[PDB]
Structure formats: C-alpha cells, structure tokens
Amino acid sequence: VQFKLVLVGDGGTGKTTFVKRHLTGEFEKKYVATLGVEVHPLVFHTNRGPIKFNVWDTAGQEKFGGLRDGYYIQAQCAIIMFDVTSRVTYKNVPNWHRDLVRVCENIPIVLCGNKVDIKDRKVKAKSIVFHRKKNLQYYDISAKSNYNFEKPFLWLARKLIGDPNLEFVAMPALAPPEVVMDPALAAQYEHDLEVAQTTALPDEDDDL
Template sequence: MDTPTFKIAVIGNGGAGKTTFVKQAAAGAEGTYLTNLGALVTPVHLSTNMGELVFNCWDTAGQEKFGGLRDGFYVQTMGVIYMFDVTSLASYQALPEWHEDVERNTEDVPAVVIGNKADAQGRAVPADELTFHLDHELPYYELSAQDGTNLAEPFLSLAQKLTGRSDLALAP
C-alpha cells in the first residue's frame, strides 16, 4: 500500500521560523529547493496508529517578498500551516494577507495556525489578543521550532482533517 502523502504550504512572514520548523519536524530529512517556484520542499514523516503519513512541506524559503509569484506555490495544496513569530506583532498582523492568498488560490483546505518562538523573551503578541485562529475557526498551537517543542501536534491536526479520521493519533 502506498504511503498517504499530502502537499502542505507553510506560510508566513520571513523570520517567523518556517524553515527551522520544517527542518526540525523532518528530523534531518533533506529538502529540495525548487528555484522556479522559490520553495524548499521537505518531507515530514508522521507515525500514527494507522500507519505512516508524509507531508511534503512547501516553505517559501525567504521568497515572501515576491508577492504575486506565490500563486504557483499553492497549486495542489492540500493543507496550510500559517506561522507567525510571537515576538513580532507585524508577523501576526500579516496573517490576514496570507489567508487572502490561500483563499484566492485554493479550495477550502484544512489549516492550522502556529505561534512560533514561544520560548523566546519579549513576546509582542499577547495570548489574549490572538483572534485570527478564532475568526477562521482554526486550531492554534504555540511551539518552539528552535528547541523542538510541540512539533507533531499541528501535523496530527492536519492529518485528522485530511484523512477524515478523528481517531487518528500519534504512534506510541
């Protein structure tokens, strides 16, 4: 049986920690840089109680500034990870713009929101002011891509939605 594989767009402002997150979650897997799309594609494997799943994570790899060129990035996207840096109010305030990109280029794909750098000093986005995920009814996770805290949970949430299996769980 083939391993279920999903294309996931990991999006957010530069400096939010997307590349570190994907590299940490991939546990050393090598990514492939697609120069024509300005994306780094890295496979993240998730072991579940129903077998292995693979998320091909498409990271804009610093190409956020090219705006309209991102549209090709979303072709066949099956899920989205919105990421912001909890120490950067601007990265949080940009989430609606990223959401507009997703809405314009995909058809109702599952998504999660990640507040990265939860281990850092100088939080700029107070937890009680986080409303983007509530407004869009999306799961929210705080994590530290740097130290590897809480990396699997966003993927598990996406896996449950993509497979339609709410009983899907991480393998022991």
C-alpha cells in the same frame, strides 16, 4: 498516504527551522532565507499507517517570493506561521491567509505562533483571535524548545485521514547489524573523532 502541505508566513518567523527540526531533529540557528520554495517529504507513523506530507516550505521575504501564490495550487493543507516576538508578522497573517484561501478554498489550515520560548513575548495570547472566524486551528509553538512542535501535523493528519482518534505511534525498531571496523579506516576515524572532541557542543546551558 500523500498530502501536499504549503507553509507560509513572514520572513524570519521560523518556517524552515520548524521543518528542519521535523526532518533531521536539528535546530538551525542561522537565518538563511528560503528562495521561492523548498519541497521536503515528511513521514509520520500513525495507528492508521504512515502518512506522508510533501511540505512546500515557501519564502516569506517578498524579494524572494518566487511564484508566490503559484505554490499553493492543489495544496491539501497548510500552516500559516508568525513570530510571537514580532507584531508585524501577526499583522500580516490576514494577508497570507487571503492569498492562501483564494487558491485553496476548503483545506484544513493551522495557524502557528512560533518562538514562544523567548521571554519578551510581544503578541500576547489574548490578542490572537484571527483564527476564530476563519476556522483555523491555533497553536503556540517553539521550534527551539519543541513546545507543541508535533501538534500542527497531528491535527492535520486527523483532518486529512478523517479519524479524530489517529495517533502517532512508535516506528518499528529493527535489530541493528554487527560491527567490523576496517583497520585501514582506523586512522581516518581518529582524525574525524579528534575534531569532534575539540568542537564544543552547542547550548551547554540547556537542561539537555
């Protein structure tokens, strides 16, 4: 029902953007460095019932590290993140992994190479082999294009529940209620709507 997940990796690799995408569906374009950690509940609906991840989204920048490996205590799973456009973030994957498994000696861990949407990829697929001897699951992901964005949590859910055939399923969709707009708020809604109409939607060149 409930599992603690620690998310680690270099600063700027997209850890917080990844979690935000899963929490609200949004893609945050700005880099606001995480300070220490932010804990976020994340629920997925599966054919074995709901599974709750308590995601500890830690800071990758050293001057914002906070408690550092103190965040890993009693974690039951983890994601190690790097950025396929920045070689140094892959070079540091062994360091994050070292500090992680010294506290969490036997947990399922996913290694994620983020930002595969960027054309000029620097960490080539064939260079990525660190997960092999360490028994980590590896995925190319992109929080921006959503490529494989669900795979880390699906794989972890299967490990944690112990069911290789666990699947995400459609959450029930209750009947929505009927509408009665207030004529007193009719003037306030036109204000909020005019601004919204004259604020351009982002990424107008995307396929959607």
